[PDB]
Amino acid sequence: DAHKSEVAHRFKDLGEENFKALVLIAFAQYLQQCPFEDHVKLVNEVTEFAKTCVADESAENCDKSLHTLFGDKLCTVATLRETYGEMADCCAKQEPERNECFLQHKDDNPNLPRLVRPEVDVMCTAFHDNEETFLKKYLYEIARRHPYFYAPELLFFAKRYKAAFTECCQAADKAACLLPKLDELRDEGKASSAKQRLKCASLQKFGERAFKAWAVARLSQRFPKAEFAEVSKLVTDLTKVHTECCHGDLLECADDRADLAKYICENQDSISSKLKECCEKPLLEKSHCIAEVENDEMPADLPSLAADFVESKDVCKNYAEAKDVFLGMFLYEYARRHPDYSVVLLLRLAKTYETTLEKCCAAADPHECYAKVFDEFKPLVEEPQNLIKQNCELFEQLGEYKFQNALLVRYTKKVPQVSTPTLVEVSRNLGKVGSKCCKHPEAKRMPCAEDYLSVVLNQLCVLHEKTPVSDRVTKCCTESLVNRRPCFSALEVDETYVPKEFNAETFTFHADICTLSEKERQIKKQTALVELVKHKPKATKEQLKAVMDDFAAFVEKCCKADDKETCFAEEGKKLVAASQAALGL
Ligand SMILES: CCCCCCCCCCCCCC(=O)O
Ligand SMILES: CCCCCCCCCCCCCC(=O)O
Ligand SMILES: CCCCCCCCCCCCCC(=O)O
Ligand SMILES: CCCCCCCC(=O)O
Ligand SMILES: CCCCCCCC(=O)O
Ligand SMILES: CCCCCCCC(=O)O
C-alpha cells in the first residue's frame, strides 16, 4: 500500500513475535515432514532478513513481492525432492504459476500420527521452562497437521492455549482445570476447521451471489446503523478475502484481512460505535476483536418492511430492472431488525420473497398476489424458534450427557439404517451444541447454535454419502442450503426397519474396557445404547435403563474379577440372555 518494502511493512504492523509465529505456520503447512529445528532456523533467517528491510527499505529483495520471497525460500529447501519431490518442479515454473503449483501440492491428509497428550505435570513443566518454544512446538505440530487452516485463526487459538496453560500450570488441581479446557479448545478448533471448509464448499457449489447474501445478513445484524452502501462495500471486500482464504493463499488472505481491519476501524463512525476498544488494539488483536465484536443497537426510528416491499406499486419494476440491489436491501433491512435470527433463516425468508416476486411479478395484478408474503415468514421463523426452545428445555432438565442419550435414542429411531459411529458422533456433537449455546438468552441462541449446527449436519452428510445407507438422509444432504435443516427436522420414525439379530457388534468385548476414562466409557455406553435400539426400535426408557444397568454390572463384575477373558466369555453369552428378555424380546 505505497510501501517500497512489503515485508518490513508487514513486520511493523505484525510485530516480531507475531511475525515469527506466522512464518512458522506458513512453512510448516508445506514442510510438514521437515524437522522442527529446520523450521526454527528458517523463521530466524526470514525474520533477520525482514529486519534488514525494516531499517533500509532500499536494501535487497526488500522490493520483491511476498509470493516471490516466499517461493524463493521454499525452493531453497535442498532436501525437498527427497522428502517432497513433486513440489520441486514447482520451482522451475515462474510466478504466478509457481505459487499456484505449491498450493496444489499441499497434503490434506499429512501422513503423521496423532498427538500423544502428555501428563499434566510434564506439560506444565515444559511450558514453564520455555513457554515460547512450547507454543512454537504446538504451532508446528498443529500447522503441519492442518495445512489449509487459516494461520491468523490458528495463532489466536495458540494464544488461548498459552492462556489456559498460564492459568492451570499455576493452579492446584491442574488436571481438574486443564483437561476440561483442552477438551473445550480441541472441540472449538475442529469446529473452526470444519466451518472454514464448509464456507469454501458453499462458495464453490453455491456460487458467490449466495456467499454475498450470507455476508449481507451477517454484517447488517452486527452493524444495524451502517448505511447500506458501507455494508455493500464490506460485502465486496470480505467476498475477496474469503475467495483467497479458500484458495489457500496465506499471504493474500492474511494481508487483505489486515487491509479490511484498517478500513473498518477508520470508518468506525459510519459502521458501528462498538468498534471503540477494537480499533485501538495491535494489528492482529483488533483484527479478531472486530470479528468478535458485539452487535450495535438498531435505531428505534425503524418502520416495517411492508411499505417498501409489499405495499409499494413500483416494486415489480424494481425487482426486474435491478434484482441484486433490491433484494440486497430487503436482506439488509430484514437482518438489521432481527439479530436473533440465524443467517440461513434470513436467506430462507429472502428466498421466499424472491420466489414470490418471480411468480407474482409476471402476472395479472402483482400486488394482491404477493401482498400476503410476510405471513408466509411467520412459520419459517417459528419452526426453528420452537425447536431450539424445546431442545434447550430438554437439555436443561437433563444434563449434556443425558441429553446426548435422549437424541441418540430419538435419532436412531428416525434413521436406524445409519452407521452406529455416525449416530454416536452426531448425537454427541448436538449435545455439545446445547452445552455451548443453551446457556445464552433466547435472542442469542439461534446465531450461536448456527455455526455449530451447520458443521455437524455437514459432518453426517459427508460421512453418510461416503457409503450411503438411507435415502431419507441422502435427500436432506443433497437438498439445497436453505432446505437442509428443515428436511432434517421433518424426518419421522422409520417403521419398515427390521431390527438386528441379537448377536455381537457391541456385545463382544475384552478387558481393554476396564481401563478407560469417563469419556471413553460413556462413548461405549452410547455405542451400546444405539445398538440396543437397533435390536428393539420401540424399546423404552425404563427398558433401556434396565439393560444398561445389567451392562454396567457385567462390567463392574468381570472387571473386578480374578480372571477377565474367561469371565467376559462366560458372562458374555449370559448378558445377551438377560438383555434379550429384558427389552421384551
Ligand atoms: C441443543 C442442541 C442444538 C440444537 C438442536 C436442535 C436441532 C434443530 C436445529 C434448529 C435450530 C435452528 C437455529 C440454529 O441452530 O441456528
Ligand atoms: C439423525 C438424523 C435426524 C436428525 C439429525 C440432525 C438433527 C438436528 C437438525 C434437525 C432437527 C431435528 C428435529 C428434532 O430433533 O426432532
Ligand atoms: C459393554 C458395557 C457398557 C457399559 C459402559 C462401559 C463400562 C462403564 C459402565 C458404567 C458404570 C461404571 C462401572 C462400574 O460400576 O464399575
Ligand atoms: C504473514 C505475512 C508475513 C510475511 C510472510 C512471508 C515472508 C517471506 O517468505 O518472505
Ligand atoms: C442469493 C439468494 C438470496 C436472495 C438474493 C439476494 C442476493 C444478494 O444480496 O446479493
Ligand atoms: C464445538 C463443539 C462441537 C460441535 C461442532 C461440530 C464439531 C465437528 O463436527 O467437528
In the chain, what are the domains? Answer: 6-104 (1.10.246.10), 120-203 (1.10.246.10), 204-292 (1.10.246.10), 305-384 (1.10.246.10), 385-490 (1.10.246.10)
Is 338 among the annotated ligand-binding positions? Answer: no
* CB of 226 closer than 8 Å to CB of 270: yes
Is 6 among the annotated ligand-binding positions? Answer: yes
How far apart are alpha carbons 565 and 576 in whole angstroms? 17
Long-range CB pairs of 476-485, under 8 A, 24+ apart, other chains included: 481/202, 481/206, 481/210, 481/344, 481/347, 482/344, 482/347, 482/348, 482/351, 484/454, 484/457, 485/344, 485/384, 485/453, 485/454, 485/457
How far apart are alpha carbons 577 and 580 in whole angstroms? 5
Q: Provide the experimental method for this PDB entry.
A: X-ray
Q: Is 528 in the pocket of ligand 3 (CB under 6 A)?
A: yes
Chain centre distance of CA 249: 20
Nearest-atom index, ligand 6, CA of 451: 5
Q: What's the 574 CA to ligand 4 centre distance in angstroms?
A: 65
Nearest-atom index, ligand 3, CA of 552: 9
Instruction: Please name the residue that has the C-alpha cell 504451532.
Output: 139
* CB of 256 closer than 8 Å to CB of 244: yes
CB atoms within 10 A of CB 37: 8
Ligand 5 binding site (Cβ under 6 Å of any ligand atom):
209-210, 212-213, 216, 324, 327-328, 331, 347, 350-351, 354
Q: What's the 463 CA to ligand 2 centre distance in angstroms?
A: 16
Give DSSP secondary structure letters for 292-315. HPPPPPPPS----SHIIIII-SSS
How far apart are alpha carbons 192 and 120 in whole angstroms? 25
What SS3 state is found at 31? coil
Handedness of CA 519, 522, 528, 534 (dihedral sign): negative
Q: What's the 298 CA to ligand 6 centre distance in angstroms?
A: 31
Q: What's the 424 CA to ligand 3 centre distance in angstroms?
A: 17
Nearest 10 degrees: Cα torsion 327, 333, 334, 335? 110
What SS3 state is found at 19? helix
Which ligand lies nearest to the CA atom of residue 251 in the structure?
4
Name which of 220, 264, 256, 258 is nearest 239 in CA terms: 256
Is 252 among the annotated ligand-binding positions? Answer: yes
In a 13 Å sphere around the CA of 403, the CA atoms on its Cβ side amount to 20
Is 358 among the annotated ligand-binding positions? Answer: no
At residue 312, φ and ψ (nearest 5 deg) are -60, 145
Nearest-atom index, ligand 4, CA of 23: 5
